[PDB]
Amino acid sequence: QTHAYHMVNPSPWPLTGALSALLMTSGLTMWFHFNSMTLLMIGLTTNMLTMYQWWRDVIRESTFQGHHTPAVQKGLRYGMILFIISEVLFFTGFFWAFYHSSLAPTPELGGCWPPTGIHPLNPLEVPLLNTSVLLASGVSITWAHHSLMEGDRKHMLQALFITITLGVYFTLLQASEYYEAPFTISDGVYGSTFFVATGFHGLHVIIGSTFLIVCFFRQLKFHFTSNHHFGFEAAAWYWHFVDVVWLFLYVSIYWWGS
Amino acid sequence: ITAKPAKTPTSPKEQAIGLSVTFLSFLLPAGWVLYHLDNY
Amino acid sequence: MFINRWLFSTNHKDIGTLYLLFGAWAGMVGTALSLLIRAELGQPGTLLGDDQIYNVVVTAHAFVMIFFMVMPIMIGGFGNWLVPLMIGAPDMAFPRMNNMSFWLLPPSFLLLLASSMVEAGAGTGWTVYPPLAGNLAHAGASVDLTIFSLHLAGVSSILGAINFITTIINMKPPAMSQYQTPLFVWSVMITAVLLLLSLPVLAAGITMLLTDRNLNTTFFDPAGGGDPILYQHLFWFFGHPEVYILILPGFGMISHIVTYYSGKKEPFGYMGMVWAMMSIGFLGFIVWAHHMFTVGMDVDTRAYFTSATMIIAIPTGVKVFSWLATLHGGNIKWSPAMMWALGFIFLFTVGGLTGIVLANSSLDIVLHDTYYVVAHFHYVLSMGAVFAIMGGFVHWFPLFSGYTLNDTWAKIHFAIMFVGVNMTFFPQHFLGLSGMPRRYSDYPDAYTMWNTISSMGSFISLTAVMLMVFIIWEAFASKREVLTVDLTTTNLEWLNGCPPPYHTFEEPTYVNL
Amino acid sequence: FENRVAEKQKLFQEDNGLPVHLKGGATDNILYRVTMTLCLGGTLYSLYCLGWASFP
Amino acid sequence: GARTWRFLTFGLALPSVALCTLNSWLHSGHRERPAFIPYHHLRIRTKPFSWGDGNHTFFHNPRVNPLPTGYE
Amino acid sequence: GGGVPTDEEQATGLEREVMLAARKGQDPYNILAPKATSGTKEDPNLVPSITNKRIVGCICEEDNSTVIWFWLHKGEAQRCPSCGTHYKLVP
Amino acid sequence: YEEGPGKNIPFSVENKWRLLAMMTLFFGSGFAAPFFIVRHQLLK
Amino acid sequence: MAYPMQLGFQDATSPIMEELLHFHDHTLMIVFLISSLVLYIISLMLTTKLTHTSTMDAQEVETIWTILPAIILILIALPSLRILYMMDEINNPSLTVKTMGHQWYWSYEYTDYEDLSFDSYMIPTSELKPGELRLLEVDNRVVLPMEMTIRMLVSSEDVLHSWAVPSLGLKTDAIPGRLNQTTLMSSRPGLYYGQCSEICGSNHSFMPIVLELVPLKYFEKWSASML
Amino acid sequence: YQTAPFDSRFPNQNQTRNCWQNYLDFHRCEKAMTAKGGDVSVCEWYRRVYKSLCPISWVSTWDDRRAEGTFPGKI
Ligand code: HEA
Ligand code: HEA
Ligand SMILES: CCCCC/C=C\C/C=C/C/C=C\C/C=C\CCCC(=O)O[C@H](COC(=O)CCCCCCCCCCCCCCCCC)COP(=O)(O)OCCN
Ligand SMILES: CCCCCC/C=C\CCCCCCCCCC(=O)O[C@H](COC(=O)CCCCCCCCCCCCCCC)COP(=O)(O)OC[C@@H](O)CO
Ligand SMILES: CCCCCCCCCCO[C@@H]1O[C@H](CO)[C@@H](O[C@H]2O[C@H](CO)[C@@H](O)[C@H](O)[C@H]2O)[C@H](O)[C@H]1O
Ligand SMILES: CCCCCCCCCCO[C@@H]1O[C@H](CO)[C@@H](O[C@H]2O[C@H](CO)[C@@H](O)[C@H](O)[C@H]2O)[C@H](O)[C@H]1O
Ligand SMILES: C[C@H](CCC(=O)O)[C@H]1CC[C@H]2[C@@H]3[C@H](O)C[C@@H]4C[C@H](O)CC[C@]4(C)[C@H]3C[C@H](O)[C@]12C
Ligand SMILES: [Zn+2]
């Protein structure tokens, strides 16, 4: 080859991924209708094994084998941006559901928002703490980025550790707020919009925190250079996305919707 | 486009066999089902 | 070796071939479903004696034709085969993720065929509206298996869209601007942008339906303060872009086929064609509620959706006139692919014009949920997508295979299909104007003559489909090896021979500034 | 910790014809076999589950 | 610089989290649960949940989440 | 405070080859668009190849949307069949 | 991997009669499936 | 109702259905003309051995084939929107009738004065009286006064349905939790038929609508007799 | 009184809030009148309008919820 692009070794992970999707969906079917978790627990396991080996191989191809030329890195930049756009449009559907229900509350709700018998959380208590936590983590991840670019290993690790700690704090606060909430997912469209929108956001915080932990261990093992660290950039972009979705949820559901 | 003559020519008789077998593979199973609908 | 090559592929050509095989198999399923529809309607009374089964057949017909036949063939098959070759790229940007887009579709298809086999199937229509699709009126696993089928097809096409956009932006020769890429490549980039933005909104909506069915949410349930009409907005916010997704790669293939068989180096008005496809893609996001003119929306909302929908005719007209201007002065070669492309131009135009009738909300009150709508979309979508697919298949078969079709057989195939689809769908205009509802298993006696003729048409297209399988067999059976192809100087995908080597453009093209 | 990237670069560039998913050694083969066994076995079980659920 | 973003992390961002942590800390303690009223738009049950007895939400809190029939 | 490797210390494989060639102003992996000569038979466009033929795309005039594609073979200069611009292979 | 006509496909075209059998089964199974699905739903 | 071999719309029963017929004639002329012009131009491009294969300049012609279509769309839009706003205009109804969709039948409520309500089911084929229409007759017709503005309100007590009467130009979706309004005015006495127009499950084909349009005095006596 | 006149507060195809508002207005008025022991006849206009517009099953369900103490509107 006299081009700069990556011809990938034939791989089994696309097939194991596709089959993990089949086992997770048929498993959810088997859990909702046939009172059994077996298929679902096989699908979740094969999904985690697929993700582990696939992203392991990407690290082998880049850090260990040198296939990530500037042209390859530019492609991964576009791929991550486009992935984030698709996730924004997914959240857009839930925000549309929320505004649709809350701007024209039906007679069943008492014709008001919040509905009769719903006692929203105080947005100035734990939801405000959660906002401070994710905004703070957007500052610390930025410190981590500049430390890496400046070649500072210790400060990159401390900043990234702080960022992960804040992600975990957010997740534990949210778990606690779920448990304390006097309303449930079954409390009409208020509970439906609240738990499904904040729940998908919670999942993205766990995914993003996991991605940052992956970057933390790769940094411990010296994988990143001061100039080449796309896994870190991608995790930082994803982390800013999670922050920004939170700001929209906080303003829409917690504050305006209270 | 230009092309070589057939490396393994398919005579008119061979084409009638291929066409017949193709049509039967579509028609017999569907025909069996539709013929037996009353029975189902 | 077989498993490494066909199950573990990282090769755009072999993955394209997997998509074409999958889509052809899907087309046989979708055709069988279509013939069962027309058999139920081919005489007055009941054939199946079970209208839940009729509704399941209608629903599966649409999902198979849209998600397993058209999108895999156009984007997965032609897109994977042609896009890298047309920009001199060595493969797709994400050649391993590309294989997962492919392998998600057999499981998606399996979940759809499971939906039809458990309980009484999903007899919902392909729109899957609650409360009919809810856990009271469709208790049990069928609708959830349909939702999961759509989730896997959705992930397949989202990752595919990321792949195509990245490939087309990032992997052209450095001298090649976006305004030096072929129209087929434009058509795939625009389709990929529509998929990227539209499928996540479908995913959100069908996820809400899943939670209403299984976790006691009430997004669409008025008892909880929900609204069935919210589902319809989310579905059609996806579903209008989806109909442009179904035709755009067809527009791209038609531009190449008309150019090629006119003996031209280039399509008429290249930048106009780029403008038209981008305009259609943008306007395709702001018209969805023309699927909802009878749900009770405000008059001003209806006036807006009527007006915005009609605007799409302007860019679309530029494409139709640009195809005719490409023919103008051509050394016309009457190949079977040219016949498909000319049939496309005519039949697409008829369907597009009945869409402009439907855009008028006032008239749509009377045409909505009638066979007039079924006639509109079988012209513009069914014949449009299928004619472009058959044109592209007969044109590029020798590139993909290294063998020629029998052109006389391929012209016979075209002639039978042209008769069958017009006999099938043209009378459905009369059924719609005269008020026959769609999604019906039986009809008042007055509607018998047109339903009889329509069902007889459906059998003519069956004969064409069976002949098509024989024609593909005859080509592989006879093994006429390609020698020379004309116009390689403006059709880069042919310049590496037939078929091209597994690895092409290992040494990239030389293009200076 | 110490920077051992050079020793991993030597291992993954070794001219042994192995695909990247198996180039780490015997542990890769094991995790591959576990993954594919769970996927193929899981898939056969899902087909059994369909057979079961297809009848009342 | 890293120096500036560290200054912001420790000088503004974490002091904010500490102040909001204080605010939350001071406004915690269980508020009195309201009178149970069996409103038909709440405690929705169209299908049993796929866990427990089918009638308990996933993060059911006996103190503040009534069943369709009232507090446990 | 150091401890982060540089590309100079740790880049490997093709990434390193591209890095080292660029420092020397060389482009063996075709990252840059080549600059045209006058393209006369005396001053042909020089087309590097690792083999005895390579595909040329000719954008005959600035902002043409149509690219003219042809195989350039080792030996005598060949001409773009649209504009007659000369190209010569340098294997 | 084998390159060239009849070699860039997951099915053999070495024998036109075995190929006819394979194409029969492939397209035939797809076209038959819906008829057997209707039969299945009618027999429940 | 439709008659055998019908090509176009049912004859108009209401002034707005008359307006839609004239609007469809205008639009269909344009559809015919454009369809025909495209087929003719295809055939003109394909019927000469004369050639011109060099690069063709596009900008002059692209003006023609954006401006002409823009004008044609405005010539469709103008009468289209006149009719849309005419339907929507304030008419002051004399009577309100509600219909509720169900799997698989319509109920009707006339509650301006008395509590009048009843179910309306398809007559089974095996029970049709000689001369009666398969899949179209109901046991209990929707009796209404002719030559009067009537407010119809449409909802559902289960899944989506859609209340349609083609000869009056009517189609309003029946959505649970929603009350959709339309107006009905028949120029003539008689029987006017329609069919459920939203897929509502296995008997979607078999829950029709029969309006019986009679003088006010007959409507009043029928109403009294139905309590 | 023939039927409910056009109400400029509810000019669109969705008449759900018109039915709801008139049902609330009747029951608010009947409570205000019964409470002072004035005459429920002043409430008659609201009664005629909600009976004209509101589906029987809606009124029936709302009446049952007022008697149960689960009516979510303010009366
Ligand atoms: C390939 C797929 C495809 C394409 C491209 C289109 C294109 C268009 N469609 Fe269609 N449509 C569908 C597939 C498609 N449609 C499907 C599947 C449904 C139903 C879904 C369901 O309910 O199941 C549907 C339904 C649908 C409806 C809803 C009807 C109803 O349910 O009541 C409407 C409403 O406006 C609409 C309009 C249009 C219009 C205005 C265009 C325009 O884009 C057409 C533009 C083209 C032309 C106009 C012809 C060429 C132009 C000229 C020659 C220039 C000159 C022309 C003029 C001046 C007019 N279509
Ligand atoms: C691409 C989309 C597509 C295609 C191709 C078709 C094809 C056909 N459709 Fe339709 N159809 C829909 C999309 C499509 N359909 C949708 C979306 C609905 C609405 C469902 C709902 O209401 O919910 C519908 C509904 C619908 C109805 C209305 C049902 C009702 O309202 O009750 C009818 C009635 O006749 C019909 C008939 C047919 C017929 C006879 C064919 C064909 O038989 C016509 C001939 C075409 C072929 C035979 C295709 C052959 C192609 C291949 C075999 C692929 C070959 C592959 C390669 C070469 C690589 N379909
Ligand atoms: C701290 C936040 C972290 C979130 C993780 C927690 C739990 C499971 C995973 C969550 C994933 C996100 C959303 C899915 C939907 C529902 C969960 C919403 C969040 C949540 O956890 O909601 C809880 C309900 O959970 C329930 O039903 C639980 C239901 C569990 C089953 C999940 C169903 C799976 C749905 C399929 C997903 C489809 C994916 C689409 C992909 C797109 C492809 C195109 C709320 O508890 P409660 O007791 O009702 O109220 C509190 C009262 N004290
Ligand atoms: C425990 C909870 C279970 C729930 C399921 C999902 C859970 C966890 C997923 C966590 C995501 C981890 C992703 C780790 C990726 C590691 C590989 C990597 O980061 O690879 C990098 C490339 O980036 C790349 O591929 C970028 C690839 C990025 C992909 C990540 C995107 C997020 C994935 C979301 C997945 C599901 C979302 C579904 C929600 C609907 C490698 O290039 P560099 O870093 O430049 O290194 C090279 C240098 O060393 C040279 O000097
Ligand atoms: C929409 C797609 C369908 C298109 C129409 C299909 C065209 C018909 C193809 C022939 O199908 C066969 O027809 C036979 C009858 O002609 C059937 O034999 C049946 O009838 C015979 C004659 O009575 C008996 O001898 C057999 O036992 C009995 O199975 C046989 O099963 C069936 O396969
Ligand atoms: C690596 C290869 C892949 C591995 C495949 C393994 C397949 C073996 C799974 C065992 O099957 C289980 O059998 C249980 C019965 O013994 C079921 O219990 C469930 O079903 C019971 C049936 O009464 C009920 O009691 C409850 O729903 C529940 O306990 C359960 O659903 C089912 O999964
Ligand atoms: C001593 C060691 C040096 C690592 C190295 O240079 O190889 C240091 C550098 C940065 C340290 C980490 C960061 O300072 C952040 C964390 C600080 C906590 O007090 C302990 C864990 C914690 C996650 C540290 C673990 C470990 O001691 C690290 C990794
Ligand atoms: Zn040139």
Author numbering:
A (entry chain C): 4 to 261
B (entry chain M): 1 to 40
C (entry chain A): 1 to 513
D (entry chain J): 1 to 56
E (entry chain G): 12 to 83
F (entry chain F): 3 to 93
G (entry chain L): 3 to 46
H (entry chain B): 1 to 227
From the article:
pmcCytochrome c oxidase (CcO), a terminal enzyme of the respiratory chain, catalyzes oxygen (O2) reduction coupled with the proton pump, generating a proton-motive force across the membrane. Mammalian CcO consists of three mitochondrial DNA–coded core subunits (subunits I, II, and III) and at least 10 nuclear DNA–coded peripheral subunits. It has been proposed that the hydrophobic channel that connects the transmembrane surface of subunit III through subunit I to the heme a3–CuB site is the O2 transfer pathway.
The FO − FO maps of CO2-treated–untreated and N2O-treated–untreated CcOs in the fully reduced state showed clear residual electron density in a site (site 2), the same as the Xe2-binding site. Therefore, we assigned the electron density to a single molecule of CO2 or N2O. At site 2, CO2 or N2O was oriented to form weak hydrogen bonds with both the hydroxyl group of Ser108I and a water molecule (Wat2). In the FO − FC maps of CO2- and N2O-treated CcO in the fully reduced state, elongated electron density was observed at a site (site 6) the same as the Xe6-binding site. Because the electron density was significantly stronger than that in untreated CcO, it was assigned to CO2 or N2O. CO2 or N2O was oriented along and within the elongated spherical cavity of site 6. When CO2 is moved from the mitochondrial matrix to the outside of the cell, CO2 that has entered the O2 pathway of CcO from the membrane may be trapped at site 2. Based on the above, we propose that CO2 bound to site 2 could be passively expelled to the outside of mitochondrial inner membrane through this channel.
